[PDB]
Write an enzyme that holds these catalytic residues in place. Structure first.
Site, PDB file in Angstrom:
ATOM      1  CG  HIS A 186      -0.527   0.335   2.469  1.00 18.03           C
ATOM      2  ND1 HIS A 186      -0.293  -0.672   3.380  1.00 18.03           N
ATOM      3  CD2 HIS A 186      -0.162   1.514   3.021  1.00 18.03           C
ATOM      4  CE1 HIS A 186       0.200  -0.085   4.452  1.00 18.03           C
ATOM      5  NE2 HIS A 186       0.302   1.229   4.283  1.00 18.03           N
ATOM      6  CE  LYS A 222     -13.748 -13.871  20.263  1.00 19.05           C
ATOM      7  NZ  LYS A 222     -13.599 -13.970  21.741  1.00 19.05           N
ATOM      8  NE  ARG A 223     -11.418  -7.891  20.905  1.00 17.26           N
ATOM      9  CZ  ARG A 223     -12.288  -8.493  21.710  1.00 17.26           C
ATOM     10  NH1 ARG A 223     -13.598  -8.384  21.489  1.00 17.26           N
ATOM     11  NH2 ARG A 223     -11.861  -9.192  22.747  1.00 17.26           N
ATOM     12  N   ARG A 239     -15.606  -6.942  12.818  1.00 14.37           N
ATOM     13  CA  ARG A 239     -16.826  -7.401  12.122  1.00 14.37           C
ATOM     14  C   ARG A 239     -16.908  -6.613  10.813  1.00 14.37           C
ATOM     15  N   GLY A 268       2.400   6.441   9.251  1.00 13.04           N
ATOM     16  CA  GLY A 268       3.837   6.543   8.981  1.00 13.04           C
ATOM     17  C   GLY A 268       4.668   5.370   9.454  1.00 13.04           C
ATOM     18  CB  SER A 314       1.974   1.398   7.108  1.00 13.87           C
ATOM     19  OG  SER A 314       2.221   2.363   6.110  1.00 13.87           O
TER      20      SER A 314
HETATM   21  C1  LIG Z   1       3.173  15.653   5.534  1.00 12.23           C
HETATM   22  O1  LIG Z   1       3.840  14.476   6.061  1.00 12.23           O
HETATM   23  C2  LIG Z   1       3.059  13.540   6.639  1.00 12.23           C
HETATM   24  O2  LIG Z   1       2.034  13.775   7.244  1.00 12.23           O
HETATM   25  N1  LIG Z   1       3.608  12.318   6.426  1.00 12.23           N
HETATM   26  C3  LIG Z   1       3.014  11.038   6.567  1.00 12.23           C
HETATM   27  C4  LIG Z   1       3.865   9.991   6.229  1.00 12.23           C
HETATM   28  C5  LIG Z   1       3.382   8.702   6.119  1.00 12.23           C
HETATM   29  C6  LIG Z   1       2.039   8.430   6.355  1.00 12.23           C
HETATM   30  N2  LIG Z   1       1.649   7.095   6.080  1.00 12.23           N
HETATM   31  C7  LIG Z   1       0.434   6.504   6.170  1.00 12.23           C
HETATM   32  O3  LIG Z   1      -0.601   7.070   6.520  1.00 12.23           O
HETATM   33  C8  LIG Z   1       0.425   5.027   5.745  1.00 12.23           C
HETATM   34  C9  LIG Z   1       0.292   5.026   4.232  1.00 12.23           C
HETATM   35  C10 LIG Z   1       1.358   5.174   3.347  1.00 12.23           C
HETATM   36  C11 LIG Z   1       1.139   5.240   1.987  1.00 12.23           C
HETATM   37  C12 LIG Z   1      -0.143   5.147   1.490  1.00 12.23           C
HETATM   38  C13 LIG Z   1      -1.212   4.986   2.358  1.00 12.23           C
HETATM   39  C14 LIG Z   1      -1.010   4.920   3.735  1.00 12.23           C
HETATM   40  C15 LIG Z   1      -2.165   4.748   4.693  1.00 12.23           C
HETATM   41  C16 LIG Z   1      -1.805   3.823   5.843  1.00 12.23           C
HETATM   42  N3  LIG Z   1      -0.586   4.281   6.528  1.00 12.23           N
HETATM   43  C17 LIG Z   1      -0.163   3.858   7.805  1.00 12.23           C
HETATM   44  O4  LIG Z   1       0.819   4.381   8.310  1.00 12.23           O
HETATM   45  C18 LIG Z   1      -0.891   2.743   8.464  1.00 12.23           C
HETATM   46  C19 LIG Z   1      -1.445   2.905   9.655  1.00 12.23           C
HETATM   47  C20 LIG Z   1      -1.830   1.933  10.718  1.00 12.23           C
HETATM   48  C21 LIG Z   1      -2.798   2.289  11.671  1.00 12.23           C
HETATM   49  N4  LIG Z   1      -3.570   3.472  11.452  1.00 12.23           N
HETATM   50  C22 LIG Z   1      -4.864   3.647  11.164  1.00 12.23           C
HETATM   51  N5  LIG Z   1      -5.086   4.903  10.891  1.00 12.23           N
HETATM   52  N6  LIG Z   1      -3.887   5.524  11.027  1.00 12.23           N
HETATM   53  N7  LIG Z   1      -2.968   4.682  11.375  1.00 12.23           N
HETATM   54  C23 LIG Z   1      -3.151   1.435  12.718  1.00 12.23           C
HETATM   55  C24 LIG Z   1      -2.603   0.164  12.784  1.00 12.23           C
HETATM   56  C25 LIG Z   1      -1.688  -0.240  11.829  1.00 12.23           C
HETATM   57 CL1  LIG Z   1      -0.943  -1.816  11.950  1.00 12.23          CL
HETATM   58  C26 LIG Z   1      -1.316   0.635  10.819  1.00 12.23           C
HETATM   59  F1  LIG Z   1      -0.409   0.222   9.922  1.00 12.23           F
HETATM   60  C27 LIG Z   1       1.197   9.464   6.758  1.00 12.23           C
HETATM   61  C28 LIG Z   1       1.682  10.759   6.864  1.00 12.23           C
END
Ligand SMILES: COC(=O)Nc1ccc(NC(=O)[C@@H]2c3ccccc3CCN2C(=O)/C=C/c2c(-n3cnnn3)ccc(Cl)c2F)cc1
Length: 238
Positions: free
Chosen positions: A44, A160-161, A163, A186, A188
């Site tokens: 992703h 379960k968490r 659905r 960030g 991920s």
């Molecule tokens: C201006 O600079 C910034 O703000 N930088 C910045 C720099 C980088 C991200 N990456 C992401 O959002 C990245 C990303 C990167 C590429 C494409 C799409 C996405 C969307 C998902 N994603 C996460 O990090 C995944 C969050 C995540 C999570 N969250 C749910 N909602 N938020 N977190 C909860 C649990 C688990 Cl295991 C997760 F893995 C965001 C902002």
């Protein structure tokens, strides 16, 4: 990372920071060194990434302030995304980066072991999620690499968490029932590292979740043991 603490330099020597230069340079995702020219990350991360030419991999970094125009990085030769990947929530959230040059191993940068096919039955008790991600849902990329110890959750309890989602055995979940410690924006693509018999294994790839560190919403990770043959196919091609 929510509820984490600052890491010590060299603690997670397989952790990398994947940056994009388009339109300006910034941290995009975490990743793990798994071979001398191989980074394991989330599929992703590459949504709308048209070319590997805009990517820069930085290894041996504790603080994002270590990165300036003069800081050395590895170029990306090839982005390999799993053929079945559609979206993080459906699984197959795995990608390999083939680097343009070889990573030289040392006390600052070295590979993490992949889990063994025989280690599918093993119970991991010492797991850690690391990254430069947000500390809360509305925050910013952190300077210092953070870490948080989190318990693994069974597929049954994770289903379960969530659905409305289909939590498959190619996914592995982790988090406290009460929340408080988890991956966030960030983080991920980074690792979920578990120490077993004094050896660290790449058990999961930070993938998705509903919010960050919420009560009864564990983090969802790519279950790396289920992709070992796919990783070997891509990295050991004749
Ligand atoms: C201006 O600079 C910034 O703000 N930088 C910045 C720099 C980088 C991200 N990456 C992401 O959002 C990245 C990303 C990167 C590429 C494409 C799409 C996405 C969307 C998902 N994603 C996460 O990090 C995944 C969050 C995540 C999570 N969250 C749910 N909602 N938020 N977190 C909860 C649990 C688990 Cl295991 C997760 F893995 C965001 C902002």
């Amino acid at each position: 990372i929510v509820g984490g603490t600052a890491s010590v330099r060299g603690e997670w020597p397989w952790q990398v920071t994947l940056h994009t230069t388009s339109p300006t340079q910034r941290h995009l995702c975490g990743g793990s060194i798994i071979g001398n020219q191989w980074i394991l990350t989330a599929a992703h991360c590459f949504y709308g990434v048209e070319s590997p030419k805009i990517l820069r991999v930085y290894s041996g970094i504790l603080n994002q302030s270590e990165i300036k125009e003069d800081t050395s990085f590895f170029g990306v030769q090839e982005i390999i995304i799993h053929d079945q990947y559609k979206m993080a929530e459906s699984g197959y959230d795995i990608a390999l980066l083939k680097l343009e040059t070889t990573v030289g191993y040392g006390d600052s940068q070295r590979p993490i072991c992949l889990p063994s096919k025989g280690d599918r039955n093993v119970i991991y008790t010492d797991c850690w999620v690391t990254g430069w991600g947000y500390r809360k849902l509305r925050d910013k990329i952190q300077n210092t690499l953070q870490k948080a110890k989190i318990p693994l959750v069974t597929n049954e309890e994770c289903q379960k968490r969530y659905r409305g989602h289909k939590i498959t055995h190619k996914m592995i979940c982790a988090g406290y029932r009460e929340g408080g410690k988890d991956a966030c924006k960030g983080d991920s693509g980074g690792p979920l590292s578990c120490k077993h018999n004094e050896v660290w294994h790449l058990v999961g790839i930070t993938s998705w979740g509903e919010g960050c560190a919420q009560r009864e919403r564990p983090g969802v990770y790519t279950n790396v043991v289920e992709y070992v043959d796919w990783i070997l196919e891509k990295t050991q091609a004749v």
